[PDB]
Design a protein around this ligand. Sequence first.
Ligand SMILES: [Cu+2]
Ligand SMILES: [Cu+2]
Ligand SMILES: [Cu+2]
Ligand SMILES: [Cu+2]
Ligand SMILES: [Cu+2]
Ligand SMILES: [Cu+2]
Lengths: 334, 334, 334
Amino acid sequence: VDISTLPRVKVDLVKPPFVHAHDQVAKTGPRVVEFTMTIEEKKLVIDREGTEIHAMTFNGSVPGPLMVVHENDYVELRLINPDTNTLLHNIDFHAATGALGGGALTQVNPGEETTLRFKATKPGVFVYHCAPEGMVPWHVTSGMNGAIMVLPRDGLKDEKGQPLTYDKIYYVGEQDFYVPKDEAGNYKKYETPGEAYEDAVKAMRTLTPTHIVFNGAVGALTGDHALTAAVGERVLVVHSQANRDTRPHLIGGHGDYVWATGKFRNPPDLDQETWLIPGGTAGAAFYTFRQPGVYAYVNHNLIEAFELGAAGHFKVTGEWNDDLMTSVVKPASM
Amino acid sequence: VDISTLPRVKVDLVKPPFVHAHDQVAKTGPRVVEFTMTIEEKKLVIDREGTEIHAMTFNGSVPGPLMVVHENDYVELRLINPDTNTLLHNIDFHAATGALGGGALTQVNPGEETTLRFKATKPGVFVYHCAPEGMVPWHVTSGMNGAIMVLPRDGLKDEKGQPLTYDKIYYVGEQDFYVPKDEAGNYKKYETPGEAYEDAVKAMRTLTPTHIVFNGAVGALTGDHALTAAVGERVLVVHSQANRDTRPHLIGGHGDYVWATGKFRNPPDLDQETWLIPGGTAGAAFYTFRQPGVYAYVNHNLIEAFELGAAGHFKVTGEWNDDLMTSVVKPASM
Amino acid sequence: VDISTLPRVKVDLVKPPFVHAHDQVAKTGPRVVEFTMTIEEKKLVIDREGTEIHAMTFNGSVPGPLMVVHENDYVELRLINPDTNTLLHNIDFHAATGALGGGALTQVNPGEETTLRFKATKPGVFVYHCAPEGMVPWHVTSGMNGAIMVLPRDGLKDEKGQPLTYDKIYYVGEQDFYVPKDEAGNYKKYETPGEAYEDAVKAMRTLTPTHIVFNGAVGALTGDHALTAAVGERVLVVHSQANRDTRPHLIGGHGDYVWATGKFRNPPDLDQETWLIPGGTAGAAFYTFRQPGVYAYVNHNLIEAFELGAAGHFKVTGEWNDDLMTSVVKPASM
Ligand SMILES: [Cu+2]
Ligand SMILES: [Cu+2]
Ligand SMILES: [Cu+2]
Ligand SMILES: [Cu+2]
Ligand SMILES: [Cu+2]
Ligand SMILES: [Cu+2]
């Protein structure tokens, strides 16, 4: 087969929790979709008390952008490592076949550039992350991870076969930070990551994170930055994790359709309250709202949710329904 | 639809691991089932060495009672907070839709009372727990949790469709306690929970429990308080967890039918040895015994089972079967 | 039924990750397969820095050998405890029914021998381990565990029904060691296990392992001891765990067919990137390779993989495929 006959299309990626424009059903044969990502290292504030870390990011955000392609398309990515960085990076896709998911061919030193083309042969949601030889967990637990969705050429289907169309799509990436704290119980500071590597390893070896955040900060999805919807809309939430297990939960709602492993060739589950997403994988949930108000989106390890910071908010417009839930007797003195 | 035409029925709840009387198949249309729960705070001994904690409970037991209703019924709960308590409580159902599962409408200060009515629209086993704004994990990891079973209007079915009828039903609730210990390695004591909140938070932030118990105490289901059955009986064990993952295991037996997420609209699994129940969810297992004797029911994280206290016992009456298992040569010297 | 009419067959077990000779489809009725295992206690080096532990083993290896039988066969095991050991051991199968999986009938003091016969009535992969009264986690987290595969009498089938034949079969057993370290941060040494029991308990109570290894040592499956295959071959990897959850991942590949709980009466999953295997269970993955080169086989808790030592290697011979993955622009300066 000649690759030079398929059409080409350029896409510009958007900062999460929003996704770039796309169609839910394909209207073309296989194509060549062209993305562009610039690695960047920067200081990040990840809580209210002003805790600072040295994060490494794709396109300058934790997590990286969510790419969306169709099955049997050709994904061509152009990765740039500017001259102001200091480390060696390389991407690694869980959707590509062979050569360590592409990590053996995308090693770029500071001030370099590479291009990798692969074929998306399996539909579902997959995880991509950095993976340099000898520093994999340090690069991954600092923010170099993201997801990619390979939709089927015909669309999503329920357990029987009828199509499933969504109105909105959000992308939530959970991230666990292991910040090294000195003997007095205070977090430390450094100048460059090379001074932080040793303490980062020593803190990672304890297997317990210090922070767990949605979208790269505490409260990054609550307040004015909350997600939005209306009663009757259909939302697809793509949840991702790269190093640790997670159990998403939508307080007040359920999961109408859940791919907990994120593979669309399998029939989904029904009426899930809390599903488990293993570490190093992405899951998808499909929900249609039925009541207005504010919703919580948490990791139902309640200590990780309400003590470490893994919580977000939904705002849904609409009109109440006294048949589903009603307050018969308001709180009185007797 | 008029709610005032459906019949009403009052139910009195029973202390676990026993369940109140009910029918496995519905013989009426939708009804209104009326429960009553009184919150109560008390000192609990949770091990053999006499470790004391300040537990908060529904109806004065850890875990709370197990309610049983049918699909599309109307659950009306009347929650009372006596004047001798000191905190603010509110229930939160994972089976109700909207308003944070009912937590935004059931806040009762000490010496108050409220009534909440919702509609059980999805069959399966669900978790309910307390959830006050700012103290969710502290209230939940002290004993304010339980389960509720919404059976289908026609009964349980296997993976092909034939009905599944059980003879007995037991309810096991696993609970993890994070008891604060002082510098010498000894557990601390307090007078009221307000003095314990700070150390409780500091101990919870370590993500490792100090105790893990079945039915609210070490050895609460072993000895004379063990569960009972006979060879040929059919038992449904409803296992619950509210904060941490668990992996139940029946030593010597299996799981004939397992709903690991606890949703009956999904086909069960077959011949499970150890299934995983995520944190903040309830699962159901259906087993028919084939050999007499004593059985262990453990959390197959063996350190949590035999070092922290998550173990219980079954006593089964019947006659042995030399065909399944037999001792050919008893332990000899050669 | 008379047991004395079925044919008998002796099998000699092989050190992992290799399996003794067997057929994928049965060519006889039910038989009586005879195994032999000798318990042995020995000092093991489990890392590069020469950390020593006192391991207890079946047949002198961590993990124990993998037995393979067919459904409805009769497994007869003869367990020997030589006079040079010092503890009391007893095996415990998750595939047998009744009497604590066989632990109540196989207690052998040093210098003894026993024989146990049971019937394999459920197909799948199961875990067996030692379980003495009062020392279960200490005996299990020192290397006394393994797996057993009970194949169906007709062979493995995919989600629709077509047979699945494998060319090679490997067995990977993950093991977590809790080595006690003294106040200076150095691992301790002892003479006999009786001196190590107390510190072993105190270290186990922290719920965090110090080492996590494939096949009983760091780097035991990398280098010249890596697993081998060719492009187009079909491999069945049987992964086991006895105390802790694990999430296997094949970097560069996928899971074509996955039994994550390891029970063959259930339809497998498709196109898994990372599946979760609960603690105290065994799972099976079936993969056919499509690209040559070196593959990583890791626990995708990347801290446990690349910081504690849970990693192995595949070497696949064959010819590259520029259509699946290709390097369009090699790393350049621009
Ligand atoms: Cu990197
Ligand atoms: Cu990965
Ligand atoms: Cu409360
Ligand atoms: Cu909850
Ligand atoms: Cu032993
Ligand atoms: Cu076991």
